[PDB]
Symmetry: D2
């Protein structure tokens, strides 16, 4: 019978690409979403049309709060309720916006969203995933190849992504005895923000050595699929950059 995966923030963009590629590889999938209900259900419908009873949706806010542990436990529970097992967790959901140090969401909200989605929710999901297995089990964290050459005024986002690197390493060490591998995929520029104009998109594209273009969502998903596959059975604690050389380019 088929293994099952949870993908967070899977309604659109890179998370959808990961969900689709896992499903095409033979996984049953939980499509987690927050606000994108119509898109999430649309995706689940397409996947169920291909193979009945292979996709469910699960709504949760991954903002930090005193109930975030319960929400994370519930996402994992939803995989077990639907499919009776949970083999793979992909921590994809992410808030991304500037938080200038020097001078509209309050700073409290900023911290809760950016640190919650990028770091604390992955940690709590990792706890819940592990405790339900306390076979090819693994976790893949969506990192960021540019966190050592950060965008100006993105402190909280960068803190969150650096914390995610720390989680990837700490959890790899601690979960290795349970046979759970923990790895990361670090895009450079992939799908550009919906709000961004084409001229600004091209500015980013022209910086990439390998082809002067952003990664497709499928290219990111290809790295995730490698890491969950049997071809990566000895790999844990690794972060694979998928950035077209962007992080090698000086100012």
């Amino acid at each position: 019978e088929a293994p099952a995966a949870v993908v967070t923030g899977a309604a659109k963009r890179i998370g959808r690409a990961i969900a689709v590629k896992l499903h095409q590889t033979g996984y049953r999938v939980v499509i987690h979403y927050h606000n994108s209900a119509e898109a999430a259900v649309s995706l689940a419908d397409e996947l169920n049309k291909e193979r009945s009873n292979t996709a469910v949706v699960c709504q949760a806010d991954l903002t930090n709060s005193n109930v975030l542990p319960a929400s994370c436990e519930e996402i994992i529970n939803s995989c077990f309720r639907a499919f009776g097992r949970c083999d793979v967790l992909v921590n994809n959901a992410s808030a991304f916006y500037p938080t200038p140090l020097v001078q509209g969401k309050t700073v409290e909200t900023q911290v809760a969203e950016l640190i919650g989605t990028n770091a604390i929710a992955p940690f709590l999901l990792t706890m819940s995933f592990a405790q339900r297995q306390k076979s090819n089990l693994s976790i893949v964290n969506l990192c960021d190849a540019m966190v050592d050459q950060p965008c100006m005024a993105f402190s909280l986002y960068n803190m969150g992504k650096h914390a995610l690197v720390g989680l990837t390493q700490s959890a790899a060490l601690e979960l290795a005895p349970y046979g759970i591998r923990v790895n990361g995929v670090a895009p450079g520029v992939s799908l550009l923000p919906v709000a961004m104009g084409e001229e600004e998109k091209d500015k980013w594209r022209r910086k990439v050595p390998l082809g002067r273009r952003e990664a497709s969502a499928e290219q990111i998903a290809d790295a995730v699929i490698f890491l969950v596959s049997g071809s990566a059975q000895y790999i844990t604690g690794s972060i694979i950059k998928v950035d077209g050389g962007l992080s090698l380019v000086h100012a």
Copy 2:
């Protein structure tokens, strides 16, 4: 007039040594503390005896919460209230304990470890910057975060976040002339609760002298980074670890 520094978690151990060395170099100091009231006041007394009106205390919990931004603003404000300026911030305060992935409530663990090690440094950095010469921030990092202790996920997340803050803030505050750097101890003062046998197991791992760093040795690197000898240094993290991070399993 004498420049002023805020040191978090400065009542004891490494934070105390930093406060003392900054004071000896000529700074007026805010000694932040959480629970160690007696030690904080005794330190302020000791420093004030050397030079009148050069040390104060400020109590605050740096656990993450919706009131933490206000608390951090008040820590910076305490420096301005006492000394009229704030030239240096040292983010030293830190919770440190294991948080196993397979298990205080988890939300308390998150609040304490990510609050003290990352979120409070960010909020303090924001408050410090909003006010603003030789201005700089020094973050107390950890040389061993890429080879972490088993079951310290939250602590390690907080310290990695602190590296990210050091880099992002260095970039963003450079236009204002505020340098932002880190000092990364390996093993320095070992936990008060740790038996000597276990302490010795750690000491034996250190290539340079088979001993932990004194608090003074960590403070020496902080002093360098705040000094005129480090005027072009920003976004750097200086390991002070006796080669410990070089030693394989």
Copy 3:
């Protein structure tokens, strides 16, 4: 290129140090994937010829051997050009270069002269990869890539292995520099960094176990095939946006403190 290269039908790869162990496993997996291969070797002539024979028995004239010493010297550039040349001679193209050959032995700071130590360790681990990379790039006449065999433990090195560690760090530098410079030609350059994989056959099991016990994921060394799996990924169509990346394949070893 002499007629009968079948250059239109299949890609070709050079694997250095490919007679045994990890290099052999890489050559075998590339061959199994559909590549023709050059098996480079230095002293392991019987093993290299035997391997190429077995591959040719599977699919005729899909493997050749090329002997070269990769020690640094004033003839090393010519030796490296000849290795790349041998791929073009045999197969009419060279799509992949795997820099696997490596000398590995202690060189304490406090029988071989120091100059031999430098020549062997820096030659095999760094200079020969550089010269092979140059020859590979210049000869380009499409999924082209280079994979460099790095070392996951180069930031926590074995005691008294300074020259080896210097060589492996230089190889990281080459991976990054070549990724940037060759990207406009569509050549990707990546690395695979084992931790502990196949240990010396001669090493006592009791010593092997000292290393195995350090590995979080399964308390075992990687197989050569597990290392080769990462090389296969990097050369594949599933890695077409990946350049300048080094994939650790170490079972968590590099995460373990002293």
Copy 4:
């Protein structure tokens, strides 16, 4: 009596600033040079005018060859010959020029010069320094930008990455002997002599902290810290002195 230091490539630029600051701190100095004989002697004269018998020059080519071990042993010997001790080694000398992968110096020469000066000579000097053995330490001049390299500088980058490996390996191995090994990694400091004003300004404008290059003295200040009593627990560390340059994305 005064400790002694060897500074490689000390006749000009950053190595000169390092030698001066060491001398000002009370060290006797060996000013190594290769081509810059007049400058080396000029510096030695200035330092000896300040304190008699505290500075000597030593000529050596640090290009890789089968006699490079002997040359490095001789540089260390020169310090013992002059001063009777050698407490500090600063590996500063460095070749720096492009070596494109795709097409008057042969590739053999390019390898020998770039890998020799930046990596192999530091290793051999480290070996000789250790073998010939207060507060002993080695400082390696690294490069803050080696993970975001200039186009077509592969051999230089290989050399500087090897130098990081040496710094780490030698710190581990020499720690039981009380020898610390550290590095200082400039970003942009003194710009190339050949570079015109427009190009120099292009590079200056990239640096977040002050939109200027490091002075040689700023680089020297970090070397001084690393050899000082204020760094006695520091080994295997590389201090970036780059004004934030390495933090700036494309």
